[PDB]
Design a protein around this ligand. Structure first.
Ligand SMILES: Nc1ncnc2c1ncn2[C@@H]1O[C@H](COP(=O)(O)OP(=O)(O)NP(=O)(O)O)[C@@H](O)[C@H]1O
Ligand SMILES: Nc1ncnc2c1ncn2[C@@H]1O[C@H](COP(=O)(O)OP(=O)(O)NP(=O)(O)O)[C@@H](O)[C@H]1O
Ligand SMILES: [Mg+2]
Ligand SMILES: [Mg+2]
Lengths: 139, 604, 606
C-alpha cells in the first residue's frame, strides 16, 4: 500500500522568488546539477514532464497558483508502474520575520520509501537550494 | 501432549558466555572487583547485627598481587566468603547469582546496593586465564579450593597446602601465554582507573621491597549530599574523572527522585564523550551521545543511576525511553546552572569568554530552550563599549517608540564600531548590538524575536519610522536624484540590484546593503571560508559633497562620461569594503588607487 | 577430590537471553528470517544427492502473513523442517544449535555457508511475543506443534487442527499488547530493509484483497563474479544499500583471499553527503557503526563489506576487539587508492569525480600519512599555463625548466583574485609555472606534504629567495642602500604594523606588496582561521623601479621623512597592499576616509 508524509522547511526567501525556483529551468539545474527538460519553454507549464538527477526522478507539474500553490506528480524510476506520488506545496510567507515556510504535503509514496524520499528531500531539495542560492544559513 | 522442561548445553554455553559476550578482554578485572565489592557488602550487612563477624579480618580491602615470575594474578578480598555449598550452587552453576538472592532475602529498606545481579560475570576471567584456583574461606566453614580450567566440570578440594586466611576469597588466576600483559603495573592501574575507580572499598595493588598502593584514593561524591561537600573535594573529583589540571569553573550537583531516581554531578571547565555513566558504583559506558546534546557536550561529570536496564556484557545499556528522560533533566539542570553563573559578574565573564560558541549553538540548534539561552548572550553596543550587555538589559534602554532590536555583524569589533550604518541609529538614540564571531548570525537567524521584539539586522535594507512632513520632503528629493540613480545603474550594470537614495547615511558617501533575504554581507564571507563546507543593493547619501558633485555631472551631460566612470566604480568598490562584501579583482581596484596617488605626486 | 560438572539455572538463564541481551527488540525478525534461511540451505543441500526431497513442496520461500484480527505475526518457510526429536534437542535446549552440527557433517569441498552457529537466536522472538506456537513438518516425521510461554517448560503436541503443510516450519507469534507495532505493513518492511534485505531466498509478505509482495527483490552482488556483473546491476545495487537517488560514479568490486577472506563492493557517489559502509556476515546485516573500518576523510565512499570469519557477539550487532579490523582498513584504502588511479586514466570521468570530492582528497593529505604521496597524484589545480584546464602535480614537474628546483603556488579567496596577483610577475619573468589554490583546504594539504618528487613546495605569498646571477646581484645591492633612508622612513610611519621594510625585486607592476614572512601562517591562512564558526606578522615590500616609489625617494631627500602629506599616502599605499596580498583592513572606515579625500580634490571640492 501507500502512505503520506508531511514536511515543513523554512526558507529565507520571499514567495515571489521561491516559486520561480521550482519552475525556472535555468535555476532548476543549479540546485539539482542534473535535469532533462523535454519542452523548449523557459518556464515549466501544466502537465509538463521532466526528469531529474540523471533521469531517476520523474516529476510533472499538474497545477500551480501564483506564488501560493505547487502540485507535482513525483515518481521514482526505482518504483513500480502503479506507484505514483503527488507533492502539494503551500507557501506561508511571514512578513514579520521575512521568510517563507513551504508546507509540503507529500502523498502517494510507498510504505517502504516514506523515509527514503524524506531523507533525500532535506538534502536535494531543502539543503541544495539553501546552498546554491543561499536561501538561509546551513549548519 | 508431552511436556518437557528447557535444558542447556553446558559444553557450548560456557564458550558463548566467555568468548561471544564481552567485546574487550580487560573487563575481567572489573567484574572481579565488583564481586569482591559485593562480598564486602554481605559481611558488612551482617556486621551491623553481629560485630563478631569482623573479628577474624577487621579490615575490609581488596588486594591485587601480580606475579610475573609465576604468571599468576591473584585478586584477594576480605568479604563474606563462600562455604562448601556456595562453591557448588552459587559459583558452580551458570546464571545462578547468589548476590541477587541476598538482595531479596534482606529486610525492606536496607541501604546496601549490590552490583551482581546476573550470575555469569564470574566466568569472564577465563578470557585471559586458562585455569583458575579460587580459594574461599567463610566464618562458618573451612577453607576450600575451587579449581577450574573453563572445561565441562570443576573440582572442589579442601585447602591444606596454602596459607590459613582469616576471611575472604583468594582467586588465583593462571593467565594465558598470550595474556601476560595484565601482569604489569600500569596495565592494572589502567583498568582500575577506567571501570572500578569509584568503588566504596580500597583496592590495594602490590607493586615493586614490596609495597601496597591504593588505586581508588578518590571517593565518589554522588553518595553524599551537596551541603557537606567542600569546594576542594569537587576539584579533586574532576581531576580524577578527567586529565585537565585546572579547577572546575562551576559545579552542579543535583538529585532527581520519584519514578526515576538518579544523581549526576556535572562540572563546567574553565576552557573549551565527556559524561560518564555509573551504575552500582561501576563504570558502564561513556559512548552515549543521546544522553547529552552536542552543543551542550562541553560540560563533564558523571551520572549515577540504579534502575537502568544494563546489557548482559555490562558495557552498554539497552534502547529505552529513560535516556530521553535523563536527557531532559540534564538540560534543565544546566539551564538553571547557567542562570546561577549569570547572577554573578566576575564568574560569568570567565564562562562566556570560554564557552561563547556553545551558548550560541544552542540557540541555533535547540528549539525548546532557545528563549532561555537568549538571556545568556552578551554582546557590545554603542551604549556599552567596554562591558558586555545582555538582551534583557537591551530592551530596558529601548525608548517607547522603538519596536525592534538592531544589530550588526562583521569580521572584527573595530570594523563594526565605526561602521557607516551606526550614524543613523545613534542619531535617533537607538542602541545597536555588535556581533564579532562568525557564529553570531547563525543564532540570530533562528531566534528572530526576543520578548516580542523583532531582531533587525542593519546591514540589510530596512525602514525606520518618521514624521509625515519629513517623508514628504524626502520623496520629492528622490525624484530630483532620479536621473542620477538610474545613471549609476547602467555604469555598475549587474553588480547590484538597483541604485536608490538612502537617508540612513550621514557622513558616508555611499554604501551597499542586502536585499532583506538570503546571506548578508558577513554571512557570505563565512560560507566561502569554511574548509569543510546574495543580492546586494547600492545606496547613496544625498547629503555628502561627493554625491552632490555627481548630481551636477549628469545635468551637464556626463551620465556616460569616461572620466566619471573612474570615480563611481572606485567609489562603489571602496564602499564594498566598509560594508563587508568581498572585493572582486583587487588588482583593478589597486590600479585605480595608484593612478590617484600618481596625480597627487604630479606624475603621469 | 570432589569433582562436579557445571550447571545452569533454567529459570534464570532464560531471562539473561531475553531482557539482558538483544538490546533492540526489532531484531527478532532478523533471527527468525535467518533461522528460516539455514533451514532452506539444509533442504537444498539434500537436493543435490536426492531430488525427491523437494517433491512435497518445490517452492522455497519465506512467507510472513500478519493477522491484526487475532494479534498474531505468522512466519512460514519451506525449509527442511524439524522432526519430533528435533523440536526437543535443537529448540528445547539452550545453546544447542542443530545448524552448527550440520556444518560439521558437511562433505569435503562444500559451498553452503549457513548462518546459525550459536543456538540462542530462536529465543529472541519472546521480546515481542508472550507465547509462540512453532508448527514444524519434516519429510521423515509427522506435523507437530511446539508451544511455549517463555517459562521453564515447553509442550509438544501433534498437529490436528492447523493446516497440513507439505514441508517447512510455521511460527505462530502471539505478539504482546505493547509490541503491536510489528503487525503493520510499514514496520515489517523497515526491519527487512535494515537487516534481512539481501537474503538469498525470496521473502514473501502478505499485505492487505490478499496479495504477496517480495521484499528481497534486490539480490546481493558480492557472491557473483565481478567480471560478470553489468554496470546497470551496480546501479540498482547502489539504490538499495543507500537511499541516494543518483547513480554511482565508480564501482570497485574486489575480493581479498589471504588470511582473512572477505568481499567488498565500494561505490563512489556523484555528490558529497556533507556510517556509510555496511558490514555483512553470511548475507546478514551486522552493523554499520565501525570506526576503524574506514578513515574519516574517506567516509564519502559507500558500499558494503561481506566477510565470514568475524568474531560475532551474542547479539550479532557488533564485532569483538580481536585486532583484525585494521587489515580490512588497509585493504579498503589500498583498493580505493588504485580505484582513484583508474578514474584518473579517464579524462571526463575524473572531471566529475574531482569536482565533487575536491575537499575529500585534499583532506587525506592533511591527516593521513601512509598514503599522503599517493593522494598528491590526484590533486588538480589551475596555474598560469593551465588557466583553462586543470593540471596535476605530475604534469607540473614535466614543464619545470632545468634550473627550477621548487614548486611555486599561491593561495587566495577566489580564482580571479590570484590570477592577477602581483606575486606572479616575478615567476613569469623566469618562465616558472605557479599553481593556484582557491579552496580553504588547499593550504592544509600543502603544509603537510611539503615536497613532491623531491621538489620543495614554496608559497610565493611568503618570503622566498629567487635565484639571480652575479651580474644582477651586484646591481641590487648597490640600489638597496640607496633606498635605505626611504625604507627606514616607511618604518616610523607604519610603526608596529610591519616588522621591516625591505626593497624586493619580485615586484614588477605593483608599487608595493606585503608578505607575512618565512614561517607561520600565510596571508590567506589567518583569514580563514578568523572566519571559522568553531574558531599576524607582516613584511612590507616596495618595487624600486615603479614611478610611485621613485617619486617617494625624492620626498625624503628634501626632509620629508615626517612630512604631513607623505603620511597620508604611505598609509594609503600600505592599506592598499593589504587588499592585494589577501589581508583584512584594521578599520575600513579610515581607509574609505582617505579615499574620499582624493575624490574630493579630484572634483575640485574645497
Ligand atoms: N570474591 C567473591 N567472594 C565471595 N563470594 C563471591 C565472590 N565472587 C563471587 N561470589 C559469589 O558467587 C556468585 C556468582 O557471582 P557471578 O557469577 O560473578 O555473577 P554475579 O556477580 O552474582 N551477577 P553479575 O555480576 O551481574 O554477573 C555471587 O552471587 C556471589 O555469591
Ligand atoms: N525455521 C526453522 N526451520 C527449521 N529448523 C529450524 C528453524 N529455526 C530453527 N531451527 C533449528 O533449531 C536450531 C536452533 O537454532 P537457533 O536457536 O535459532 O540458533 P541458531 O540459529 O542455530 N544459531 P544462531 O543463529 O547464531 O543463534 C537450529 O540449529 C535449527 O536446526
Ligand atoms: Mg559477578
Ligand atoms: Mg538462530
Amino acid at each position: 500500500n501507500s502512505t503520506s508524509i508531511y514536511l515543513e522547511p523554512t526558507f529565507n526567501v520571499p514567495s515571489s522568488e521561491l516559486y520561480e525556483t521550482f519552475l525556472d529551468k535555468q535555476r532548476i539545474l543549479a540546485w539539482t546539477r542534473s535535469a532533462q527538460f523535454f519542452n523548449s519553454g523557459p518556464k515549466l507549464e501544466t502537465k509538463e514532464k521532466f526528469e531529474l538527477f540523471g533521469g531517476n526522478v520523474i516529476s510533472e507539474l499538474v497545477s500551480c497558483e501564483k506564488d501560493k500553490k505547487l502540485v507535482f506528480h513525483w515518481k521514482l524510476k526505482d518504483w513500480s508502474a502503479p506507484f505514483n506520488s503527488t507533492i502539494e506545496m503551500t507557501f506561508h510567507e511571514s512578513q514579520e520575520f521575512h521568510e517563507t515556510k513551504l508546507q509540503v504535503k507529500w502523498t502517494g509514496i510507498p510504505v517502504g520509501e516514506e523515509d527514503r524520499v524524506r531523507a533525500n528531500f532535506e538534502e536535494y531539495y531543502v539543503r541544495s537550494i539553501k546552498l546554491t542560492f543561499g536561501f538561509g544559513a546551513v549548519l | 501432549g508431552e511436556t518437557f522442561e528447557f535444558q542447556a548445553e553446558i559444553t557450548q554455553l560456557m564458550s558463548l558466555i566467555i568468548n561471544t559476550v564481552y567485546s574487550n578482554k580487560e573487563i575481567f578485572l572489573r567484574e572481579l572487583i565488583s564481586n569482591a565489592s559485593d562480598a564486602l557488602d554481605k559481611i558488612r550487612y551482617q556486621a551491623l547485627s553481629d560485630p563478631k563477624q569482623l573479628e577474624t579480618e577487621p579490615d575490609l580491602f581488596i588486594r591485587i598481587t601480580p606475579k610475573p615470575e609465576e604468571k599468576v594474578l591473584e585478586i584477594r578480598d576480605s568479604g563474606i566468603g563462600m562455604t562448601k555449598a556456595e562453591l557448588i550452587n552459587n559459583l558452580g552453576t551458570i546464571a545462578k547469582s547468589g548476590t541477587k538472592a541476598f538482595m531479596e532475602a534482606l529486610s525492606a529498606g536496607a541501604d546496601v546496593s549490590m552490583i551482581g545481579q546476573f550470575g555469569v560475570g564470574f566466568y569472564s576471567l577465563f578470557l585471559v586465564a586458562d585455569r583458575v584456583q579460587v580459594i574461599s574461606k567463610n566464618n562458618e566453614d573451612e577453607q576450600y579450593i575451587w579449581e577450574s580450567n573453563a572445561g565441562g566440570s570443576f573440582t572442589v578440594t579442601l585447602d591444606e597446602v596454602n596459607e590459613r586466611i582469616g576471611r575472604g576469597t583468594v582467586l588465583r588466576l593462571f593467565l594465558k601465554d598470550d595474556q601476560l600483559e595484565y601482569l604489569e603495573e600500569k596495565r592494572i592501574k589502567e583498568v582500575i582507573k577506567r571501570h572500578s575507580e569509584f568503588v566504596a572499598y580500597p583496592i590495594q595493588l602490590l607493586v615493586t621491597v614490596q609495597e601496597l598502593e591504593e588505586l581508588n584514593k578518590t571517593k565518589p561524591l554522588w553518595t553524599r549530599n551537596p551541603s557537606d561537600i567542600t569546594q576542594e573535594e569537587y576539584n579533586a573529583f574532576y581531576k580524577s574523572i578527567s586529565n585537565d589540571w585546572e579547577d572546575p569553573l562551576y559545579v552542579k550537583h543535583f538529585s532527581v527522585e520519584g519514578q526515576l531516581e538518579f544523581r549526576a554531578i556535572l562540572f563546567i571547565p574553565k576552557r573549551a564523550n565527556n559524561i560518564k555513566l555509573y551504575v552500582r558504583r561501576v563504570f558502564i559506558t561513556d559512548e552515549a551521545e543521546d544522553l547529552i546534546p552536542e552543543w551542550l557536550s562541553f560540560v563533564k561529570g558523571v551520572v549515577d543511576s540504579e534502575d537502568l536496564p544494563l546489557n548482559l556484557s555490562r558495557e552498554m545499556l539497552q534502547q529505552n525511553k529513560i535516556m530521553k528522560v535523563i536527557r531532559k533533566n540534564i538540560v534543565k539542570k544546566l539551564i538553571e546552572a547557567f542562570n546561577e553563573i549569570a547572577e554573578d559578574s566576575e564568574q560569568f565573564d570567565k564562562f562566556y569568554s570560554a564557552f561563547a560558541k556553545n551558548i550560541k549553538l544552542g540557540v541555533h540548534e535547540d528549539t525548546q530552550n532557545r528563549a532561555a539561552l537568549a538571556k545568556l548572550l552578551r554582546y557590545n553596543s554603542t551604549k556599552s563599549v567596554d562591558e558586555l550587555t545582555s538582551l534583557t538589559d537591551y530592551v530596558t534602554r529601548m525608548p517607547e517608540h522603538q519596536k525592534n532590536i538592531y544589530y550588526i555583524t562583521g569580521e572584527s569589533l573595530k570594523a563594526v564600531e565605526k561602521s557607516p550604518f551606526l550614524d543613523a541609529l545613534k542619531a535617533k538614540n537607538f542602541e545597536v548590538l555588535f556581533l564579532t564571531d562568525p557564529i553570531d548570525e547563525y543564532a540570530f537567524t533562528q531566534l528572530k524575536e526576543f520578548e516580542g521584539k523583532t531582531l533587525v539586522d542593519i546591514t540589510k535594507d530596512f525602514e525606520l519610522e518618521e514624521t509625515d512632513e519629513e517623508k514628504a520632503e524626502r520623496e520629492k528629493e528622490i525624484k530630483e536624484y532620479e536621473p542620477l540613480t538610474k545613471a549609476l545603474k547602467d555604469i555598475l550594470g549587474d553588480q547590484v540590484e538597483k541604485v536608490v537614495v538612502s537617508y540612513k547615511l550621514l557622513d558616508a558617501p555611499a554604501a551597499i546593503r542586502t536585499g532583506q533575504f538570503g546571506w548578508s554581507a558577513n554571512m557570505e564571507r563565512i560560507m566561502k571560508a569554511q574548509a569543510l563546507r546574495s543580492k546586494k543593493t547600492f545606496e547613496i547619501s544625498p547629503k555628502s559633497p561627493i554625491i552632490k558633485e555627481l548630481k551636477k555631472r549628469v545635468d551637464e551631460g556626463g551620465a556616460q562620461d569616461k572620466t566619471v566612470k573612474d570615480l563611481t566604480n572606485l567609489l562603489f568598490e571602496t564602499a564594498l569594503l566598509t560594508s563587508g562584501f568581498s572585493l572582486e579583482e583587487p588588482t583593478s581596484f589597486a590600479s585605480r588607487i595608484n593612478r590617484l596617488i600618481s596625480l597627487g605626486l604630479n606624475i603621469d
